Amino acid sequence: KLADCSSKSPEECEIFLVEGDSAGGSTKSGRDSRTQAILPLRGKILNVEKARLDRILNNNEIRQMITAFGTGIGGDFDLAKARYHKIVIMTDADVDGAHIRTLLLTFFYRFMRPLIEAGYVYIAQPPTGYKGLGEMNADQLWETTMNPEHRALLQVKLEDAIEADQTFEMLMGDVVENRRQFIEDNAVYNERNITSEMRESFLDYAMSVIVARALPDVRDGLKPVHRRILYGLNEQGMTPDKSYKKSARIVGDVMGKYHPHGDSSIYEAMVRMAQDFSYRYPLVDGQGNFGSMDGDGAAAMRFTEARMTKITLELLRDINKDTIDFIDNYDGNEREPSVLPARFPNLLANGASGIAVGMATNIPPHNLTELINGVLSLSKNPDISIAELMEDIEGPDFPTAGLILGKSGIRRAYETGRGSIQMRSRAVIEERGGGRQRIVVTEIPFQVNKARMIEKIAELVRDKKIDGITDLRDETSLRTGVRVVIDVRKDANASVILNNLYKQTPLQTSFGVNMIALVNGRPKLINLKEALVHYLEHQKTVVRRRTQYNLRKAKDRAHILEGLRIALDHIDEIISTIRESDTDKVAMESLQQRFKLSEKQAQAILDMRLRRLTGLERDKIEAEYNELLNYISELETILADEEVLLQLVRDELTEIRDRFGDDRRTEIQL
Amino acid sequence: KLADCSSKSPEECEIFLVEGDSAGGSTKSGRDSRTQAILPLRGKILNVEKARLDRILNNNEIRQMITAFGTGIGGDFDLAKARYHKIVIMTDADVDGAHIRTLLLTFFYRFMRPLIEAGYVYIAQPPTGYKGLGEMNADQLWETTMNPEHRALLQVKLEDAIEADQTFEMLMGDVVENRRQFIEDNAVYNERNITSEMRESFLDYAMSVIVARALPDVRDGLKPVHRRILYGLNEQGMTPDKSYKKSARIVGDVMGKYHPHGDSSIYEAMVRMAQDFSYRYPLVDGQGNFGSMDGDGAAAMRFTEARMTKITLELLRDINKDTIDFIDNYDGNEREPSVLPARFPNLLANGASGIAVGMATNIPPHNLTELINGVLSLSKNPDISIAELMEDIEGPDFPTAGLILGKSGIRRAYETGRGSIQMRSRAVIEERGGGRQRIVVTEIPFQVNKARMIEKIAELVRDKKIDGITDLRDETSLRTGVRVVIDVRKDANASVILNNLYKQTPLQTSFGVNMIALVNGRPKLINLKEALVHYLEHQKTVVRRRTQYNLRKAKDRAHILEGLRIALDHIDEIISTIRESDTDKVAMESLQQRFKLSEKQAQAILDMRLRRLTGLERDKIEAEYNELLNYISELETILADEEVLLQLVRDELTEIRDRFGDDRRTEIQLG
DNA sequence: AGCCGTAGGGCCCTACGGCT
DNA sequence: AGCCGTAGGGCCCTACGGC
Ligand SMILES: O=C1COc2ccc(N3C[C@H](CCNC[C@H]4Cc5cccc(Cl)c5C4)OC3=O)nc2N1
Ligand SMILES: [Cl-]
Ligand SMILES: [Cl-]
Ligand SMILES: [Cl-]
Ligand SMILES: [Mn+2]
Ligand SMILES: [Mn+2]
Ligand SMILES: [Mn+2]
């Protein structure tokens, strides 16, 4: 909805395009309303390079810009009717605002190309460090970005019409592989030429989606939003032994500290982590309505509560023992983990699916006993083959159970990273009395919506697209579990109906495996052994660093305790020394001198409470020291022999297998 | 919408009504889907005692119920066509769920009475402690509420049709005064008869809105949502000196801790406190788009940042010195203040508007300097008249400045608590060249939406209801301020046009004063002096309790200093005593009997660190003891003489006036 | 009239890749 | 063709009282 300017001389009038009304309100308050109109849009606009033509012309946003510009489109473009001589793209200073700019330019170039050639399209430059313009105060948006006296608008120029053509089709067109080859050749881990602006802005968007949004890290199997939710729960001590915490608090916590994005993305990613039909090993324990297999969303975040599951403690275990590198957060006010310790193989256990740019990923979940057995075998034989690994890891193990048809799709996916896996419901034919039968479905394929699949069966029966079905009911319940009943007409073959259902409904569904994950911060198609080799290497690194951290801290503490033991052994001299010093600093110097102490030891002596001089407190000091010396010698044994450290890796993985390993759910049928 | 059950036999089928899809999901997952259908609604349902039939019949929620029930309505009702023989009202277990229940009952009583008389209407009893059914797990909603083996449904009974009629008309009808009377007459601060159910659930709703939602407390000027926000900022140290904090963290924090309601009510309440066109003395310091006078909303909470203003530190000043009573929060997991110390008279300074039940409140804002001089005059003269307080407090002072026409409406509002005050835009007539003129408006009345005012004027011009306006523009800008231009046709009398605009548009707007506030937890219409009296009596209690807290605290400390003095004087024997003690208890027991020490004194000695034995601490400890003793008598002098306590209140008020007092913005012109 | 301000409640558009 | 899941972006109904 346009906020027009009062002047009607197009030569001096500017229209700014902003992402929405949050951004529009700061822009309206700061503008010069005589000459500066504002059109807030609605986020991502239609990609006209990919869209059917009738659909573009019906698009509400497309239509409001055409109307606003007054020019018309395509053949009917009349540049003499433009209502503004500066069209100013002013999206947010983040990667999504870069994307929206590339979509806006695609539309101008494909439908209002003379606007560009006439020098009418500009790119505003609002400062970085604000999530959107709505975060800026009006006078700041004026002085930095909109005031003609200070701003630095870039004018879009079209130099090479053929290169611009090709550019728009490669970046914005539907041939993914040309977009993908552009990203790989260019990935890096005033006036403005449109080709160049399109390239740099789309690459800026595409790389961010690839390494910091849609794909999981090979080491902990997490995407950034999930890693930040799980770190946020741990920062707040939201452990299984504590009471549930309001989901609104959690989301608001994670958004402000670590994840500068919309609340629905954070909340709905936390939700998936609590759903036992989505996560093979759920990472979040939800209290309340957390959605169903029928596609119902969760309850609004003001109602639900959450904490960590017990297995999530294994993801976070030893995160504060210098086991993983922390990084600066998005605004330099917080620290966050680049990766979680991940003391079970979470990428394969829970799987992943993510639509990135130029590529996607689709990793099925696995049984945790089999995975760790697989890692165990790899650790005892670096040259193990994929086939040997499949003796441990039979194939996927979906939270929703069901059946897998055959093994060659599994084997291809594990050997190459790509493969097609036919999944089936668990369905039986059974008698219902009076000579009649029914088909009874008790498990359905992974990621299939049950209500949607039932409606698809009702549509087929209604439209006479399948014969033999008299009735269709969902009898699922907490007491029953999943139970879908399809009653068969008397004397009709119910095996033929079922096989037809497998052909015409999601009762059979394929899972296309496409195992892409971040390896060393780069997207990579990996096979099964590589995924396990990267995980095992992470675990050797974590436990080595935890050992190195534990040894430093123990030695420091022992060093302190040696000072307290000296003080307990010479308590009268300690008192005399301190009492005869004017100041704490003279005391600290004199203690260092008399008793050969370090500064840290002297300050520990000065900080000791008189209660530490009682009998049982002196014994406590001696006991902690003796215990610490034994602990130090054990830690040093581990760092001195790579084999002992590798054996500690296997032992802690075996402990996790025994505590959290469960039975396989999906049956793999020959 | 409707998740129907599979049985088509009505006598065994039940339909549960819940507030929405969040509640519906838990209900749908817990139900027995053979006999239990579910219809989520959309929150507050239409009050059909107040609405006419055309609106009712086209309301989406009402239609869905009628279709689902199958019986038709009114004279078309047919009990034989009921698709269920149990209609179960299962709203959330909170006062707004009680309200929705009264609304649904009203609809059944007025359109489907034979359903009640057949005993087909029931009330479910989900357990308390959940914000909505969407917080329960599926299985616990089944076992507590839906399972026929353990549930306690209430069958709605109609026992006297004359009493029911009158009850529905009184509680839900148009006339407000009968509703207000029922609340006043009744407020206290497995089958169910419908009149009892309607009176109980409605009174619960009404009392909760009256005393814990829409009306300000007379002492600190705040409604519960605003108090909890501001307390929330203070408990997280979001002070003016610290950086801004993310609005979403604040809102999520306040909702979990103290305010179990929608995030839109929390965020919008914080937003208004940050608007210098809404608050005469803004309590929240906002970062980003916090809305405008055109009725633009604030940026969404994921974009904005907030902290306290400096004047808000005065609302919170002394909150940690036992000056106000803390209470348990909604779930018993937290403590929250019942009232803030409010070291400036914030009820009148910032005003309030609120719609409650059976009553509303409209308090206009005032100039801080005038208010405090008012309170000061009062404190010197309990018998002071309203005319004399108006020598200090001339009338409201809107953040939007503007003009007030005359004093008679102000005077009536201050004497009785009610009165109409005419607000006028600041408007001049000026030349624009070529012999033509214009009207220029630079200030609009309080709470008038500028863009809406402009389009009303434009509407009068295009509908030829006002002569002589040729053009109209909004030239407002950050550099210019508010500036609306109205061009006048050449030769037209721009003063006639102006006067017509005051008549026909919000350019002139009334403020209807209705000073209702909470006095001792009860709503009360109060005049200006009573409002000032209650505030001053608050300031006396706060300063007296603060003084008593510092006295208690200073005496505990001097006591500790006396025990440490003794230790430092016998430090060798203190150390030995301790060293030969196996446990801290034996040490405690020994120190007390040897040096005549209390438990806390001997605990302080055992807690003392070694660095405290340096040779100037004894004098440093003696130094603090003798100032503390000077400090204890200063405090005791205040508590011994009420005139001194009163003078201390005046002194701290005068200093607040000097630091935050500012000039009057609204001009009162005579009438 | 419809607006003030705390409350109850929810829906739909867009991009992106790969499988059907 | 339209589904999967992280992302960008917003709008409407209801109660309540006084004018
Ligand atoms: O308690 C907390 C904690 O952390 C938070 C972070 C962030 C946000 N939020 C919420 C809000 C966006 C969600 N509602 C948008 C409405 C627009 C619209 C239009 C038509 C139909 C519908 Cl249904 C809707 C829904 O914007 C924002 O930033 N809230 C919270 N709350
Ligand atoms: Cl300590
Ligand atoms: Cl304090
Ligand atoms: Cl208005
Ligand atoms: Mn944005
Ligand atoms: Mn509710
Ligand atoms: Mn008027």
JSON list of N, CA and C (backbone and C1' of nucleotides) and ligand atoms in Angstrom, two decimals, chain A residues 247-249 251-253 255 261-264 301-302, chain B residues 248-249 251-252 255 263 300-303, chain C residues 10-11, chain D residues 10-11, ligand 1:
[
{"chain": "A", "resi": 247, "resn": "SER", "atom": "N", "xyz": [8.03, -21.93, 26.23]},
{"chain": "A", "resi": 247, "resn": "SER", "atom": "CA", "xyz": [8.64, -21.88, 24.90]},
{"chain": "A", "resi": 247, "resn": "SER", "atom": "C", "xyz": [8.87, -20.45, 24.44]},
{"chain": "A", "resi": 248, "resn": "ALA", "atom": "N", "xyz": [8.01, -19.51, 24.84]},
{"chain": "A", "resi": 248, "resn": "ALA", "atom": "CA", "xyz": [8.21, -18.11, 24.49]},
{"chain": "A", "resi": 248, "resn": "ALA", "atom": "C", "xyz": [9.51, -17.56, 25.07]},
{"chain": "A", "resi": 249, "resn": "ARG", "atom": "N", "xyz": [9.77, -17.82, 26.36]},
{"chain": "A", "resi": 249, "resn": "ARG", "atom": "CA", "xyz": [11.06, -17.45, 26.95]},
{"chain": "A", "resi": 249, "resn": "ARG", "atom": "C", "xyz": [12.21, -18.01, 26.14]},
{"chain": "A", "resi": 251, "resn": "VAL", "atom": "N", "xyz": [12.41, -19.15, 22.95]},
{"chain": "A", "resi": 251, "resn": "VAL", "atom": "CA", "xyz": [12.53, -18.56, 21.62]},
{"chain": "A", "resi": 251, "resn": "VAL", "atom": "C", "xyz": [13.09, -17.15, 21.71]},
{"chain": "A", "resi": 252, "resn": "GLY", "atom": "N", "xyz": [12.52, -16.34, 22.61]},
{"chain": "A", "resi": 252, "resn": "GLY", "atom": "CA", "xyz": [13.00, -14.97, 22.77]},
{"chain": "A", "resi": 252, "resn": "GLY", "atom": "C", "xyz": [14.46, -14.92, 23.18]},
{"chain": "A", "resi": 253, "resn": "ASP", "atom": "N", "xyz": [14.86, -15.83, 24.08]},
{"chain": "A", "resi": 253, "resn": "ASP", "atom": "CA", "xyz": [16.25, -15.98, 24.48]},
{"chain": "A", "resi": 253, "resn": "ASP", "atom": "C", "xyz": [17.14, -16.27, 23.26]},
{"chain": "A", "resi": 255, "resn": "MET", "atom": "N", "xyz": [16.60, -15.94, 20.06]},
{"chain": "A", "resi": 255, "resn": "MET", "atom": "CA", "xyz": [16.57, -14.94, 18.99]},
{"chain": "A", "resi": 255, "resn": "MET", "atom": "C", "xyz": [17.49, -13.77, 19.30]},
{"chain": "A", "resi": 261, "resn": "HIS", "atom": "N", "xyz": [16.56, -14.02, 13.47]},
{"chain": "A", "resi": 261, "resn": "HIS", "atom": "CA", "xyz": [15.58, -14.39, 12.45]},
{"chain": "A", "resi": 261, "resn": "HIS", "atom": "C", "xyz": [14.19, -14.43, 13.09]},
{"chain": "A", "resi": 262, "resn": "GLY", "atom": "N", "xyz": [13.20, -14.87, 12.32]},
{"chain": "A", "resi": 262, "resn": "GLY", "atom": "CA", "xyz": [11.82, -14.81, 12.77]},
{"chain": "A", "resi": 262, "resn": "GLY", "atom": "C", "xyz": [11.51, -15.88, 13.80]},
{"chain": "A", "resi": 263, "resn": "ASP", "atom": "N", "xyz": [10.55, -15.58, 14.67]},
{"chain": "A", "resi": 263, "resn": "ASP", "atom": "CA", "xyz": [10.24, -16.49, 15.76]},
{"chain": "A", "resi": 263, "resn": "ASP", "atom": "C", "xyz": [9.64, -17.79, 15.26]},
{"chain": "A", "resi": 264, "resn": "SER", "atom": "N", "xyz": [8.86, -17.76, 14.18]},
{"chain": "A", "resi": 264, "resn": "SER", "atom": "CA", "xyz": [8.31, -19.01, 13.66]},
{"chain": "A", "resi": 264, "resn": "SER", "atom": "C", "xyz": [9.40, -19.96, 13.19]},
{"chain": "A", "resi": 301, "resn": "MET", "atom": "N", "xyz": [3.41, -20.71, 20.77]},
{"chain": "A", "resi": 301, "resn": "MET", "atom": "CA", "xyz": [4.52, -20.85, 21.70]},
{"chain": "A", "resi": 301, "resn": "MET", "atom": "C", "xyz": [4.21, -20.26, 23.08]},
{"chain": "A", "resi": 302, "resn": "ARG", "atom": "N", "xyz": [3.19, -19.41, 23.21]},
{"chain": "A", "resi": 302, "resn": "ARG", "atom": "CA", "xyz": [2.81, -18.95, 24.55]},
{"chain": "A", "resi": 302, "resn": "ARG", "atom": "C", "xyz": [2.22, -20.07, 25.40]},
{"chain": "B", "resi": 248, "resn": "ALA", "atom": "N", "xyz": [12.00, -8.82, 22.09]},
{"chain": "B", "resi": 248, "resn": "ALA", "atom": "CA", "xyz": [11.47, -10.18, 22.14]},
{"chain": "B", "resi": 248, "resn": "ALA", "atom": "C", "xyz": [11.93, -10.92, 23.40]},
{"chain": "B", "resi": 249, "resn": "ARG", "atom": "N", "xyz": [13.17, -10.70, 23.83]},
{"chain": "B", "resi": 249, "resn": "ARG", "atom": "CA", "xyz": [13.63, -11.29, 25.08]},
{"chain": "B", "resi": 249, "resn": "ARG", "atom": "C", "xyz": [12.81, -10.76, 26.25]},
{"chain": "B", "resi": 251, "resn": "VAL", "atom": "N", "xyz": [9.75, -9.46, 26.26]},
{"chain": "B", "resi": 251, "resn": "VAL", "atom": "CA", "xyz": [8.38, -9.94, 26.22]},
{"chain": "B", "resi": 251, "resn": "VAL", "atom": "C", "xyz": [8.31, -11.42, 26.63]},
{"chain": "B", "resi": 252, "resn": "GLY", "atom": "N", "xyz": [9.12, -12.27, 26.00]},
{"chain": "B", "resi": 252, "resn": "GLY", "atom": "CA", "xyz": [9.18, -13.66, 26.43]},
{"chain": "B", "resi": 252, "resn": "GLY", "atom": "C", "xyz": [9.47, -13.79, 27.92]},
{"chain": "B", "resi": 255, "resn": "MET", "atom": "N", "xyz": [6.33, -12.62, 30.04]},
{"chain": "B", "resi": 255, "resn": "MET", "atom": "CA", "xyz": [5.21, -13.54, 29.91]},
{"chain": "B", "resi": 255, "resn": "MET", "atom": "C", "xyz": [5.45, -14.82, 30.70]},
{"chain": "B", "resi": 263, "resn": "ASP", "atom": "N", "xyz": [1.41, -12.43, 23.76]},
{"chain": "B", "resi": 263, "resn": "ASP", "atom": "CA", "xyz": [2.57, -11.56, 23.58]},
{"chain": "B", "resi": 263, "resn": "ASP", "atom": "C", "xyz": [2.22, -10.24, 22.90]},
{"chain": "B", "resi": 300, "resn": "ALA", "atom": "N", "xyz": [7.70, -5.02, 14.35]},
{"chain": "B", "resi": 300, "resn": "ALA", "atom": "CA", "xyz": [7.47, -6.26, 15.07]},
{"chain": "B", "resi": 300, "resn": "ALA", "atom": "C", "xyz": [8.57, -6.46, 16.11]},
{"chain": "B", "resi": 301, "resn": "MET", "atom": "N", "xyz": [8.24, -7.20, 17.17]},
{"chain": "B", "resi": 301, "resn": "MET", "atom": "CA", "xyz": [9.12, -7.24, 18.34]},
{"chain": "B", "resi": 301, "resn": "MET", "atom": "C", "xyz": [10.49, -7.84, 18.03]},
{"chain": "B", "resi": 302, "resn": "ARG", "atom": "N", "xyz": [10.62, -8.61, 16.94]},
{"chain": "B", "resi": 302, "resn": "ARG", "atom": "CA", "xyz": [11.94, -9.12, 16.59]},
{"chain": "B", "resi": 302, "resn": "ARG", "atom": "C", "xyz": [12.88, -8.03, 16.11]},
{"chain": "B", "resi": 303, "resn": "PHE", "atom": "N", "xyz": [12.38, -6.82, 15.83]},
{"chain": "B", "resi": 303, "resn": "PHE", "atom": "CA", "xyz": [13.21, -5.74, 15.30]},
{"chain": "B", "resi": 303, "resn": "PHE", "atom": "C", "xyz": [13.60, -4.70, 16.33]},
{"chain": "C", "resi": 10, "resn": "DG", "atom": "P", "xyz": [-5.10, -20.23, 18.61]},
{"chain": "C", "resi": 10, "resn": "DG", "atom": "O5'", "xyz": [-5.29, -20.01, 17.03]},
{"chain": "C", "resi": 10, "resn": "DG", "atom": "C5'", "xyz": [-6.13, -20.79, 16.25]},
{"chain": "C", "resi": 10, "resn": "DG", "atom": "C4'", "xyz": [-6.50, -20.03, 14.98]},
{"chain": "C", "resi": 10, "resn": "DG", "atom": "C3'", "xyz": [-5.57, -20.22, 13.78]},
{"chain": "C", "resi": 10, "resn": "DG", "atom": "O3'", "xyz": [-6.35, -20.50, 12.63]},
{"chain": "C", "resi": 10, "resn": "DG", "atom": "C1'", "xyz": [-5.89, -17.91, 14.22]},
{"chain": "C", "resi": 11, "resn": "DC", "atom": "P", "xyz": [-5.73, -21.33, 11.40]},
{"chain": "C", "resi": 11, "resn": "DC", "atom": "O5'", "xyz": [-5.28, -20.21, 10.36]},
{"chain": "C", "resi": 11, "resn": "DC", "atom": "C5'", "xyz": [-6.20, -19.21, 9.95]},
{"chain": "C", "resi": 11, "resn": "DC", "atom": "C4'", "xyz": [-5.76, -18.61, 8.63]},
{"chain": "C", "resi": 11, "resn": "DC", "atom": "C3'", "xyz": [-5.21, -19.61, 7.62]},
{"chain": "C", "resi": 11, "resn": "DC", "atom": "O3'", "xyz": [-5.84, -19.43, 6.36]},
{"chain": "C", "resi": 11, "resn": "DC", "atom": "C1'", "xyz": [-3.64, -17.85, 7.97]},
{"chain": "D", "resi": 10, "resn": "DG", "atom": "P", "xyz": [6.61, -7.04, 8.34]},
{"chain": "D", "resi": 10, "resn": "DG", "atom": "O5'", "xyz": [5.04, -7.29, 8.13]},
{"chain": "D", "resi": 10, "resn": "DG", "atom": "C5'", "xyz": [4.19, -6.32, 7.55]},
{"chain": "D", "resi": 10, "resn": "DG", "atom": "C4'", "xyz": [2.99, -7.00, 6.92]},
{"chain": "D", "resi": 10, "resn": "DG", "atom": "C3'", "xyz": [1.67, -6.84, 7.67]},
{"chain": "D", "resi": 10, "resn": "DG", "atom": "O3'", "xyz": [0.68, -6.32, 6.79]},
{"chain": "D", "resi": 10, "resn": "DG", "atom": "C1'", "xyz": [2.09, -9.14, 7.17]},
{"chain": "D", "resi": 11, "resn": "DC", "atom": "P", "xyz": [-0.55, -5.44, 7.35]},
{"chain": "D", "resi": 11, "resn": "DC", "atom": "O5'", "xyz": [-1.66, -6.52, 7.72]},
{"chain": "D", "resi": 11, "resn": "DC", "atom": "C5'", "xyz": [-1.97, -7.54, 6.80]},
{"chain": "D", "resi": 11, "resn": "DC", "atom": "C4'", "xyz": [-3.30, -8.15, 7.12]},
{"chain": "D", "resi": 11, "resn": "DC", "atom": "C3'", "xyz": [-4.31, -7.15, 7.68]},
{"chain": "D", "resi": 11, "resn": "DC", "atom": "O3'", "xyz": [-5.56, -7.30, 7.04]},
{"chain": "D", "resi": 11, "resn": "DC", "atom": "C1'", "xyz": [-4.06, -8.99, 9.14]},
{"chain": "E", "resi": 1, "resn": "LIG", "atom": "O1", "xyz": [6.94, -14.33, 23.33]},
{"chain": "E", "resi": 1, "resn": "LIG", "atom": "C1", "xyz": [7.64, -14.09, 22.34]},
{"chain": "E", "resi": 1, "resn": "LIG", "atom": "C2", "xyz": [9.18, -14.40, 22.30]},
{"chain": "E", "resi": 1, "resn": "LIG", "atom": "O2", "xyz": [9.91, -14.09, 21.10]},
{"chain": "E", "resi": 1, "resn": "LIG", "atom": "C3", "xyz": [9.21, -13.53, 20.06]},
{"chain": "E", "resi": 1, "resn": "LIG", "atom": "C4", "xyz": [9.92, -13.23, 18.92]},
{"chain": "E", "resi": 1, "resn": "LIG", "atom": "C5", "xyz": [9.26, -12.67, 17.84]},
{"chain": "E", "resi": 1, "resn": "LIG", "atom": "C6", "xyz": [7.89, -12.43, 17.97]},
{"chain": "E", "resi": 1, "resn": "LIG", "atom": "N1", "xyz": [7.14, -11.87, 16.92]},
{"chain": "E", "resi": 1, "resn": "LIG", "atom": "C7", "xyz": [5.74, -12.26, 16.72]},
{"chain": "E", "resi": 1, "resn": "LIG", "atom": "C8", "xyz": [5.34, -11.46, 15.49]},
{"chain": "E", "resi": 1, "resn": "LIG", "atom": "C9", "xyz": [5.15, -12.32, 14.26]},
{"chain": "E", "resi": 1, "resn": "LIG", "atom": "C10", "xyz": [4.18, -13.47, 14.47]},
{"chain": "E", "resi": 1, "resn": "LIG", "atom": "N2", "xyz": [2.82, -12.98, 14.24]},
{"chain": "E", "resi": 1, "resn": "LIG", "atom": "C11", "xyz": [2.64, -12.27, 12.98]},
{"chain": "E", "resi": 1, "resn": "LIG", "atom": "C12", "xyz": [1.17, -12.03, 12.71]},
{"chain": "E", "resi": 1, "resn": "LIG", "atom": "C13", "xyz": [0.93, -11.32, 11.38]},
{"chain": "E", "resi": 1, "resn": "LIG", "atom": "C14", "xyz": [-0.28, -12.00, 10.81]},
{"chain": "E", "resi": 1, "resn": "LIG", "atom": "C15", "xyz": [-1.07, -11.63, 9.73]},
{"chain": "E", "resi": 1, "resn": "LIG", "atom": "C16", "xyz": [-2.16, -12.39, 9.35]},
{"chain": "E", "resi": 1, "resn": "LIG", "atom": "C17", "xyz": [-2.47, -13.54, 10.05]},
{"chain": "E", "resi": 1, "resn": "LIG", "atom": "C18", "xyz": [-1.69, -13.91, 11.13]},
{"chain": "E", "resi": 1, "resn": "LIG", "atom": "CL1", "xyz": [-2.11, -15.35, 11.99]},
{"chain": "E", "resi": 1, "resn": "LIG", "atom": "C19", "xyz": [-0.58, -13.16, 11.54]},
{"chain": "E", "resi": 1, "resn": "LIG", "atom": "C20", "xyz": [0.41, -13.36, 12.66]},
{"chain": "E", "resi": 1, "resn": "LIG", "atom": "O3", "xyz": [6.53, -10.68, 15.14]},
{"chain": "E", "resi": 1, "resn": "LIG", "atom": "C21", "xyz": [7.55, -10.97, 15.98]},
{"chain": "E", "resi": 1, "resn": "LIG", "atom": "O4", "xyz": [8.63, -10.46, 15.85]},
{"chain": "E", "resi": 1, "resn": "LIG", "atom": "N3", "xyz": [7.18, -12.71, 19.07]},
{"chain": "E", "resi": 1, "resn": "LIG", "atom": "C22", "xyz": [7.84, -13.26, 20.10]},
{"chain": "E", "resi": 1, "resn": "LIG", "atom": "N4", "xyz": [7.11, -13.55, 21.23]}
]
